[PDB]
Design a binder for this molecule. Structure first.
Ligand SMILES: Cc1ncc(COP(=O)(O)O)c(/C=N/[C@H](C)P(=O)(O)O)c1O
Ligand SMILES: Cc1ncc(COP(=O)(O)O)c(/C=N/[C@H](C)P(=O)(O)O)c1O
Lengths: 380, 380
């Protein structure tokens, strides 16, 4: 694959392999690892990360909705995939044919699907309980038993799993976590029998309480080398390796005289004779306007973004005359300086999760494996 | 195509047609309209908008970088295309061969392109001047003459046009605007002969001063039915039709009891007996976390987004117990109420330009033309 703009993101698959393999070591051998690669693998490349995670010890994959699961199938992934979110009852037949497990949390969904499907492929369901997150999931005993009954009666409906999700597993204080875990324990007792897969842990819960994961963990954010939250950074068992980095290059360099203005609204004014550089990355690339008071790295040094950020490009103050084509690092390391996703996240006033997901389709992903380029993925 | 999740964007091509046709009527017969279609047509869909704009009176298209132009060419667009940003000297042959015009602003670029390209296709260049935007462009007299000379000197290099871009055309205060306009008229005198295409106006300048735009207008934001700024709004010659809308559907509804918490960090607590709905859209779709206290439309009413916004889902407080499947409008009209892109931008503390651009590849675009569904574009 090829690209024609000097702006690209690099995904270190070696880092991903290490993050997942260290988990495989940490957890009891009888506990499976389900790698969650929804949202195009948190913006890292769905199939590339999936292949890698499976190599390091993961046995299943998780995605947000049906289209994401179907896309993985079309790209050659044959491992089991669980759809974590909602789906259309009418699509049960397509999920069954492609061997995609579904999440179920209401009986009227199953009523509707029983009438539209009748073999020959079995559909594997994972019953979702709401133990305190308030998103999706059952909350009553009568509804839980109704769902199980409706699944029990249809010869092609199978209950493969049962799970819940934590809302504060990344908080040092474990009060709410404890309530949720205990509630899950109580709700499990409402089932006539234990299905083969019982899961509840995300990255934070599995890294902190490996022994309280039952038989399968849904490993996300940490797989990409990002800490669930800064609070538990010191509580992590093994060092995480960040996999994402973003780069660009100077396409224009010029010296301004005192008084000249830069960018939209003419917000910035040079005061001395200064060198301004232009890089081909803007907010349509996910480098949002709120980042106008942040900085990038040029020739091992910090350089401030100057003026307002544009849709496809932005300006920065240079230390002096640098050659056109000089590499600029938005996220990553250059010399002794470094800009991590958490730094960007702080500035955007969000969590690290949102940063790589916002780096758009417009930006090419270059995959590294064994310290060498494996492939380039240019969405457009 | 088709999608398997109930979240989708709607693009009204009839609105886009009208926005362009009105300008076509407002402008002189000699003046061309170059529809700016970069960033996937501001998140609206590149081919669909490019095609509609051409039908409405536009004669040319403008893109941000080479990959965007090649993408249009591969989807059957055969109209002229100008790359507004930078490109590599080594890609000049690719651009020539695909009939793509390139922006030039440095003499060393040409010196390099000359050594690499010898023929046989002619490459049309548009000389960018920097009048006070500080982004891209030539600033001095002898740099301009050196570029012109290098072009004149090459048998396959053609200077088809030259242009500038205004930094404050949307500002009521026209003082910096007139400075740039004056600077441009002056820099035009460094050229021996006035090229066939001279352009300078974006949506703001073309709609405000349609006669002082020379023979080509670069039309962007206004084509999508969005005002360049809130201040310019009552100065525009005709009403703009908003073309982008965003919808989803309730995939879960539940009644929470007081004290119960919702979403990450359990930052929302139900105080009364509230019905809570879960919709399948989140920050990985461009519906950023910052929109947490924003109001969406459900059954003709404003309903607040309660608790933290997740990667693929978020929660809202319902007026009452509505059935699963109920349409929720994030951007658009629901009977009596309307949420415009300007409303979302206000909450995100940004400009309308950024909003549709951020709605990701994950969200399908449904196109309407002649009041009928025309096409469904699903990126994954
Ligand atoms: C049901 C489920 N299991 C596992 C994970 C993996 O969690 P993590 O990346 O912290 O290890 C997630 C992540 N989701 C995002 C965090 P969101 O809720 O925003 O869709 C999840 O929703
Ligand atoms: C050179 C050039 N000409 C024309 C336009 C059309 O402008 P408009 O949408 O106001 O009609 C733009 C838009 N670009 C965004 C405004 P950015 O500069 O942020 O990439 C442009 O960059």
């Amino acid at each position: 694959n090829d690209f024609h703009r000097d702006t690209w993101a690099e995904v270190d698959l070696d880092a991903i392999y290490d993050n997942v393999e260290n988990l495989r070591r940490l957890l009891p051998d009888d506990t499976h690892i389900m790698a969650v690669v929804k949202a195009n693998a948190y913006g890292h490349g769905d199939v590339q990360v999936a292949r890698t995670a499976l190599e390091a010890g993961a046995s299943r994959l998780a995605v947000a909705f049906l289209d994401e699961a179907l896309a993985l199938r079309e790209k050659g992934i044959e491992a089991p995939i669980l759809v974590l979110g909602a789906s259309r009852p009418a699509d049960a037949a397509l999920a069954a044919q492609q061997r995609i497990a579904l999440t179920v949390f209401r009986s009227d969904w199953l009523e509707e699907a029983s009438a539209l499907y009748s073999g020959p492929f079995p559909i594997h369901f994972h019953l979702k309980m709401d133990t305190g997150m308030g998103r999706l999931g059952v909350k009553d005993e009568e509804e839980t038993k109704r769902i199980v009954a409706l699944i029990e009666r249809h010869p092609h409906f199978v209950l493969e799993g049962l799970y819940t999700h934590f809302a504060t597993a990344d908080e040092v204080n474990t009060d709410y976590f404890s309530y949720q875990y205990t509630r899950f324990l109580h709700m499990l007792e409402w089932l006539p029998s234990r299905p083969p897969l019982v899961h509840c842990a995300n990255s934070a819960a599995s890294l902190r309480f490996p022994d309280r994961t039952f038989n399968m963990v849904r490993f996300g954010i940490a797989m990409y080398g990002l800490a669930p939250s800064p609070g538990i950074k010191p509580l992590l068992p093994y060092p995480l390796k960040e996999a994402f980095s973003l780069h660009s290059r100077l396409v224009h360099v010029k010296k301004l005289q005192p008084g000249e203005k830069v960018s939209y609204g003419a917000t910035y004014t040079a005061q001395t004779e200064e060198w301004i550089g232009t890089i081909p990355i803007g907010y349509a690339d996910g480098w949002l306007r709120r980042l106008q008071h942040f900085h990038v790295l040029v020739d091992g040094q910090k350089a401030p973004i100057v003026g307002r950020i544009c849709m496809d490009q932005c300006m920065i103050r240079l230390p002096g005359p640098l050659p056109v084509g000089t590499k600029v690092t938005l996220i990553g390391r250059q010399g002794d300086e470094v800009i991590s996703i958490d730094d960007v996240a702080r500035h955007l006033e969000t969590i690290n999760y949102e940063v790589p997901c916002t780096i758009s389709y417009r930006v090419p992903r270059i995959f590294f494996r064994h310290k060498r380029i494996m492939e380039v993925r240019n969405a457009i």
